[PDB]
Amino acid sequence: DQFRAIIESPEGAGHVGYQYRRNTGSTMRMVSDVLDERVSLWDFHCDPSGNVIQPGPNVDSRQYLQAAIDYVSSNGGGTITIPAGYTWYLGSYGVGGIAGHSGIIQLRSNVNLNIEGRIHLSPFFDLKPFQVFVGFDNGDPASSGNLENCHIYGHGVVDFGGYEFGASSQLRNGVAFGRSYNCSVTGITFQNGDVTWAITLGWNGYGSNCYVRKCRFINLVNSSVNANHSTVYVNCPYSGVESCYFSMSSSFARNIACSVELHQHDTFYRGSTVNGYCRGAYVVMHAAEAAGAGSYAYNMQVENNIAVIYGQFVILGSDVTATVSGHLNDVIVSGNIVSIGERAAFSAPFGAFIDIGPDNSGASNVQDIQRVLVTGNSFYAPANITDSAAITLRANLNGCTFIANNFDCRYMVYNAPGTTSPVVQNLVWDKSNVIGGTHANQRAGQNLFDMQFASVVNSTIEVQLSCEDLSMFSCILFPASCQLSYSKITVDSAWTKSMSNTAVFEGNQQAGANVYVSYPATVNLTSYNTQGAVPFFSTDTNYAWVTSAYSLSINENLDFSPPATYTNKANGQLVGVGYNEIGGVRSVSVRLMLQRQV
Amino acid sequence: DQFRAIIESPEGAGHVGYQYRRNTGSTMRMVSDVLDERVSLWDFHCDPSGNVIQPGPNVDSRQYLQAAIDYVSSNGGGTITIPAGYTWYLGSYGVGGIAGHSGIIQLRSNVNLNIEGRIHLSPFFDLKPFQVFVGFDNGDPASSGNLENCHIYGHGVVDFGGYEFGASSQLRNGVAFGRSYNCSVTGITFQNGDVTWAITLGWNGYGSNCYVRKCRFINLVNSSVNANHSTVYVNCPYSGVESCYFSMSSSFARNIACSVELHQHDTFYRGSTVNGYCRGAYVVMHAAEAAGAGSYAYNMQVENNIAVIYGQFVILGSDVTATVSGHLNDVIVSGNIVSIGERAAFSAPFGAFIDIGPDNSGASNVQDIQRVLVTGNSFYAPANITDSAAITLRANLNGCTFIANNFDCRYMVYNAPGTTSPVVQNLVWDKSNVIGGTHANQRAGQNLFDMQFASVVNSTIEVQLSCEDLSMFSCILFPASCQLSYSKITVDSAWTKSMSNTAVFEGNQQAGANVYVSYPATVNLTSYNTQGAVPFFSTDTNYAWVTSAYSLSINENLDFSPPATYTNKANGQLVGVGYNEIGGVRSVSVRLMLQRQV
Amino acid sequence: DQFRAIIESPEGAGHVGYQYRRNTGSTMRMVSDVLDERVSLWDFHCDPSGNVIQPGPNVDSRQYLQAAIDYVSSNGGGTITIPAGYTWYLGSYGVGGIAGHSGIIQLRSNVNLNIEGRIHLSPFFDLKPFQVFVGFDNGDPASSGNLENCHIYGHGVVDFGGYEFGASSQLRNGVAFGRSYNCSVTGITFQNGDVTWAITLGWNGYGSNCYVRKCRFINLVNSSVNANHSTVYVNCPYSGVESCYFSMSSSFARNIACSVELHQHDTFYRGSTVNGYCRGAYVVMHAAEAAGAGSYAYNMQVENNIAVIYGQFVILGSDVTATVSGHLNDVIVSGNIVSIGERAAFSAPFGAFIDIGPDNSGASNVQDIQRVLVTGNSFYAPANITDSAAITLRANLNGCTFIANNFDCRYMVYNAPGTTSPVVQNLVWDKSNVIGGTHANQRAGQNLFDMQFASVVNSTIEVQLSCEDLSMFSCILFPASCQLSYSKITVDSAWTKSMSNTAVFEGNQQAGANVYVSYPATVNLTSYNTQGAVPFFSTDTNYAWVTSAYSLSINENLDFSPPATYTNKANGQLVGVGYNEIGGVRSVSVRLMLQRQV
Numbered sequence A, B, C: 001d002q003f004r005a006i007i008e009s010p011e012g013a014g015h016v017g018y019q020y021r022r023n024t025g026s027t028m029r030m031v032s033d034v035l036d037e038r039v040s041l042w043d044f045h046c047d048p049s050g051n052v053i054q055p056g057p058n059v060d061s062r063q064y065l066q067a068a069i070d071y072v073s074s075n076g077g078g079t080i081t082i083p084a085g086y087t088w089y090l091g092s093y094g095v096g097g098i099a100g101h102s103g104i105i106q107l108r109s110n111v112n113l114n115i116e117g118r119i120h121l122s123p124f125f126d127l128k129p130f131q132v133f134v135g136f137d138n139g140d141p142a143s144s145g146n147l148e149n150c151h152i153y154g155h156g157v158v159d160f161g162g163y164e165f166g167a168s169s170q171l172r173n174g175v176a177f178g179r180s181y182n183c184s185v186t187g188i189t190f191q192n193g194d195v196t197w198a199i200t201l202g203w204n205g206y207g208s209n210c211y212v213r214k215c216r217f218i219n220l221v222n223s224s225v226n227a228n229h230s231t232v233y234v235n236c237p238y239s240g241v242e243s244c245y246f247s248m249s250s251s252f253a254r255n256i257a258c259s260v261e262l263h264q265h266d267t268f269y270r271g272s273t274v275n276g277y278c279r280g281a282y283v284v285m286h287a288a289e290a291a292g293a294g295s296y297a298y299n300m301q302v303e304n305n306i307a308v309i310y311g312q313f314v315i316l317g318s319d320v321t322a323t324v325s326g327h328l329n330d331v332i333v334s335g336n337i338v339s340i341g342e343r344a345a346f347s348a349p350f351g352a353f354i355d356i357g358p359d360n361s362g363a364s365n366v367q368d369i370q371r372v373l374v375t376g377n378s379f380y381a382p383a384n385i386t387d388s389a390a391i392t393l394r395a396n397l398n399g400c401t402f403i404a405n406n407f408d409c410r411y412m413v414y415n416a417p418g419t420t421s422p423v424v425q426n427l428v429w430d431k432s433n434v435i436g437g438t439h440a441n442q443r444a445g446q447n448l449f450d451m452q453f454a455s456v457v458n459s460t461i462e463v464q465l466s467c468e469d470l471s472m473f474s475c476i477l478f479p480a481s482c483q484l485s486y487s488k489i490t491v492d493s494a495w496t497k498s499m500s501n502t503a504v505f506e507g508n509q510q511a512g513a514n515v516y517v518s519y520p521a522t523v524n525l526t527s528y529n530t531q532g533a534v535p536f537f538s539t540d541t542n543y544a545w546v547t548s549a550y551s552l553s554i555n556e557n558l559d560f561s562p563p564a565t566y567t568n569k570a571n572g573q574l575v576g577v578g579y580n581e582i583g584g585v586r587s588v589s590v591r592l593m594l595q596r597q598v
């Protein structure tokens, strides 16, 4: 039986003819040709005699998956399926160029992985570093070639085995695409680990068009050893994260974990849900990462996300090295709904919607951050969380614009006294920002806008309360150490009638030539005796800076009326003309709106 | 011919050898192994002798599809293809655990359906209830196990046969995922029915990570019998609807159909287009649904949708049962563009962008709704639609914030007089909301903000017109039955010069100690005779509450000038100091901005 | 060997039995049946004897791909794979109905293309027109049938060969879906050409539910011959573009290329990144395109995009033909972050966030554009780019509303003097729009809001600076040729103290009966001699229109004080009552806020 021998051999399929649907005009093929149109791990998961090996906890699938990728790479590419209904364990390190990255599998250009089954790490990796899928082809990323056109997708799962880090200095990753152009991860669930990142895109600005979409990241920090975690790190331009789910349950994640970092221009983070993390996203130009795409991170978008976090939602930064200066500009943060989860005050990093963070070494005088728009977001922190702010402004800021947000937390603008002394320019807080009332009555000894800065210039703060909080010391306070110039600071009178202090300038900074200010105050006045039109003058002489003032109080009297409006005099008194129906010296205490140049 | 017999048998493929692309290092397989990597309905759509059966209107495909799902379930899962180019009819009910749900097909964990062809309901189902795909495994959902990792996707179609409901009490559904974790529907067209829902996600808070993406829902209500319709009902957290299309053509849909309901925390509805529906989305915490995820619906997002509807866009609610109280908070509604379609006034449910709706029994004193941000939306209703409002505020409200919207409809804030008397707290209407002019000249007898409430506290209404409408009775009216306290109510003077009434307080509520108000009014004044500085006093004594007023009128006179600014007196007169170049009693009628504590 | 003959024949696979996974309950099939479940180009890419032909630059694959589409069409449809690891060249025109469209491949209903490999145009097409994939079935689109349920998707590539246009009048396209219902392109990279469009959806309003998602468009203009380019043209309703990437590198693209055009109702452009283009999106109702969906483009959404462009971001338009009038309304532009790329002033079309453009023939008196909301966007242009505006308002406008944007460019509102004279209604510029300072000191001879119109009615401009720019001639200027009525124009005083001109009305238009205005000015006053309450009067008589004015200056004097507030007199003087502690004629120069009816 010669024909029998061929048919039963591995070339058997190549001798059975086939023509699509018996169509006379279709290609006369062999069964093997049609089967060759697809490829799976089963086609490489075999022993040296070619007998298929069943996957399992006792089998290391690494070499077989690598053989599949290497082969498909050699044919110009394709898509390898990792079959559903099986768990495929990885139990050794890869070799060659990915060894320097603690790599397991080496990705190759044009070779996609359709992961329908589960990929699981074996206990070999317990307490060890690892990067599961690596797209670099050299231990030195600077000498690595590119990875192009590599997509990982499916309904499958990458499971990191639950193993803790062995040492804080170790690094662990799921997918490092490397110097990556047109690469993506879609649909995959990454779970059950203690890792540094789940996915990294690009390398120091090298790369383009890399995306993470519709992925889940679940419980990826689990130990006190883990130094730091950011689930997706975007280090190439024209790249981003969309429609993903991020969840952590460990206490440690609330102190160290961030969902996304955006580190190059034209990058985005949109439409995603975050729970249990410390931080939402870093948006930062690191000078050390400026090689591939320049020293500017611009066109940065964080939009339409949903988050419960314990520290800061968006952290802005930029820094310098010996020879390069990083710049961050043209950022939009819009449409996000964010809360600080239930926690004790000071039990996690300081709660904030926006943080202007110092560099990794703690320097606050290196940053060049400007042209940032924060608009149409909602932020909430529970009433007990003292450490919650719309913005913690902890390093030099060259501009940030807030319009039409709803911020319901302890502070609006904050920086800790006796820490950094930021230089602030072009901070714009529009009157359309609504200040919520959750923290009313909690603010004893506190200033709602606590302006603990070296200096403030070209800034606008338009304070509008929407309910009373008589516990606060002031709506806005500038310590004497903070210079203030070419700025507009206003406090709307609504809900302020009973406040002893509204705006406080501890160095009398509101007297500056180009400071435009208005706020309520209580003023004692006394009139002359004259019947008829009669002047009223303030008893105090603290108003040399006031350009006009007007009454916010009713007049309980019949026989006279104080002035509706006032100007000042050289000695610092207010003066206006009221009316004595009957003569007599009058004395009244009136609530006035004090105005300077507005 | 022994070998011939084996090759022609069903085990024939298992005797033909194959090795991928003749690669010496690839697995030596059999053709059957490679074919076994995929699975379709054809592999189960056969008679008892194993002969394939062709689908068609005369064939019930249910048992075969169920057999396929049951089998793949037993192997740890996979994806069953429902082939393109065929219509597969379902013509009987399923059995076992899904019978209590009028179920047709029972879904099982890890078994995906790739629907490329059409699934059609046979006339067996005419006038009957049905739920086409059911993920519960018990008639009692409380005793049901979970459905996990079940995805339905493809370019295919579920067609409900056009059959009307037989009775209003019947229920019909397309996909009920059940107690559903990591389940989704993507790409599918659901059409041609009279159903209650197309898709339901979760059960009373049990479930997670369920999504509906890139689906179409077309003509899914067609009869007067249909009691109610919501196309997608999201009843588990961390779930949502994205990039879907919803269309109805029936008149009945304009009165009963909603596109989406969001009923648990961290849920979303984004980027979708709606036409022909009554309602856009319910966003509600039902106490009766609080078992799986708690009694709070928070982190609720409705964003970037496009809608033509006939009733209300977003309906907020919360309610209670004997032992549980539902709460709704931390909601964002942003970036939506919505219109009321062409219709006669009062011909469908009352038109609204936001509705604060009573509970199912009509109770308006059970709701706990707060921390809602409505920002950056546009709403339009044609000029004839009397029943159109930015917000219909019909039940107790604990807070809602409007910033930077464009509302072009009959009313801004409305509630019907002599219906409910809501208790209102923390209603914030920022001055950045633009009020359109489509309904100018239509408002005879109407108040633009009709404050028909029991009480209003800690609220802000900053009215800014952008064109004249002298037909309206007032910009804002508070009936004497509505208490008003700790609130700010302002009417900007632009386009108001000719209005007889701007703000109306029928119980003189603007006199409250912590009410901050400003609005224009016309006032008659008379001066004393004195040459020189001379007082002017109002003829009326209705101004005991005014803290200051200033002129909005020019002075046509040469020989005198009235005061630019006024205060009040104990008897309720305004008083200010003007100037008589020549003596004489003066009498003038002036438009003033009346101010209280602002 | 009779059995051998059958097995080796093209019917061989139809004689080898198969039963899925040896399941006794599965269908007893033949291998051919299972292989027949899929279909690829390999099944048709053969010679007349049925021998497979290898693709390559020397092989025209067109006829084979067409045969595949024609065949699958005949079976009710399916998905044809274009295999990965191969480049498939097209080298001739198609025949029949697509010839009138210079068509290569004719698409057919229900036949999807899964493009995993590359499709490349051969040099046959150099200097020639072409439309690669055409869904029309007639040379005359008006006589064409529909294309339904056609999806093109995959990780593959359409490469236009780099060939330049041969003549400016030629047209080139990638995918013309035609009269297209439920058609889409997903994941595909279109690159390396000189084309008119990459994708067109619909035809003159005929079509529905067509989408372009997750596609890349790279370097699709390369010559001075190319007349015009818009990458995706949306010409059917309920359709749009989402999550796409658009990049150009040619200088010509900066002058002629637009990323998207939206031309019918309920269409969108979202979540996309654009670099190197002239324009972002046209949003236009062309009367010539009103056949299929009506003469109104409404529910138009441009949201959450990222762009670097050289001309205009969003261009609005509508026009008329002999018998049809186009209307554009109900548009939202929100959440976009856009910059003008580095370029010399006037070196590309005039930079703008919004352009109200004239029609194709240059007519500016045909447009009906209204109910547009522009909110929560950021725009930046470098300081040297004189030709940069938030809005270039160059044709009649019936309404546009700006709320809560950040605009950092040369002009806010602009139209060139001595060009068109638009009639403007319902232009609303809310005070929540933040005006950036990049162009401070660059504005010599320029007006920030340059109101070069025939007339302005029912409009609001609330100017708020956030830093000083004393170079500008004025904040807002109306030439005498521009009528102004029923409008509100205000200039906030912050950063204006040193400006000689704030608001300028060259025809004294601010005196209109229903003009509501406020702005700062410097005024010289002189008092009478009288000790005590004493009048101050302006020296100039230019204030007959002023209803009130108040001091923006401090009083450096001890012996007297000028009035805090003023009204006017019939002769055009201001007058107020100040106070002389000691008698004497006083003379002062004061900065006042002039107010009319506000």
Ligand SMILES: CC(=O)N[C@H]1[C@H](O[C@@H]2[C@@H](O)[C@@H](O)O[C@H](CO)[C@@H]2O[C@H]2O[C@H](CO[C@@H]3O[C@@H](C)[C@H](O)[C@@H](O)[C@H]3O)[C@@H](O)[C@H](O)[C@H]2O)O[C@H](CO)[C@@H](O)[C@@H]1O
Binding pocket: A100, A101, A102, A141, A171, A176, A196, A200, A202, A203, A204, A227, A228, A229, A233, A235, A286, A288, A289
């Ligand atoms: C400036 C820089 O090194 N950037 C890295 C980036 O590094 C981050 C750093 O920005 C900071 O965020 O903290 C974390 C700590 O978790 C990172 O630092 C750690 O990792 C870097 C990167 O690691 C090296 O380079 C990789 C490409 C190799 O695969 C890896 O084996 C290792 O050689 C390391 O230099 C630090 O010492 C370590 O603390 O990380 C991103 C994402 O991986 C990378 O793109 C960028 O170059």
Ligand SMILES: CC(=O)N[C@H]1[C@H](O[C@@H]2[C@@H](O)[C@@H](O)O[C@H](CO)[C@@H]2O[C@H]2O[C@H](CO[C@@H]3O[C@@H](C)[C@H](O)[C@@H](O)[C@H]3O)[C@@H](O)[C@H](O)[C@H]2O)O[C@H](CO)[C@@H](O)[C@@H]1O
Binding pocket: B100, B101, B102, B141, B171, B176, B196, B200, B202, B203, B204, B227, B228, B229, B233, B235, B286, B288, B289
């Ligand atoms: C409190 C509650 O029952 N919630 C149901 C939800 O029910 C809605 C209800 O919220 C209201 O919206 O009106 C509609 C009417 O169209 C619904 O009520 C109708 O359906 C419910 C649910 O049906 C039962 O439970 C299902 C899980 C079974 O499959 C079904 O066979 C039936 O036993 C019913 O109790 C009402 O009497 C009926 O009027 O509906 C959602 C979505 O299905 C569900 O998740 C939730 O538990």
Ligand SMILES: CC(=O)N[C@H]1[C@H](O[C@@H]2[C@@H](O)[C@@H](O)O[C@H](CO)[C@@H]2O[C@H]2O[C@H](CO[C@@H]3O[C@@H](C)[C@H](O)[C@@H](O)[C@H]3O)[C@@H](O)[C@H](O)[C@H]2O)O[C@H](CO)[C@@H](O)[C@@H]1O
Binding pocket: C100, C101, C102, C141, C171, C176, C196, C200, C202, C203, C204, C227, C228, C229, C233, C235, C286, C288, C289
């Ligand atoms: C009114 C109109 O013709 N609309 C066309 C649309 O045409 C655009 C036009 O709106 C303008 O934008 O400039 C460009 C120039 O690049 C277009 O005009 C050019 O193309 C049109 C359309 O071409 C004809 O009709 C197609 C359906 C055929 O496939 C083609 O072979 C040709 O017969 C042409 O009439 C102009 O003369 C030419 O300058 O284009 C869109 C998208 O294709 C189309 O849907 C709409 O009908």
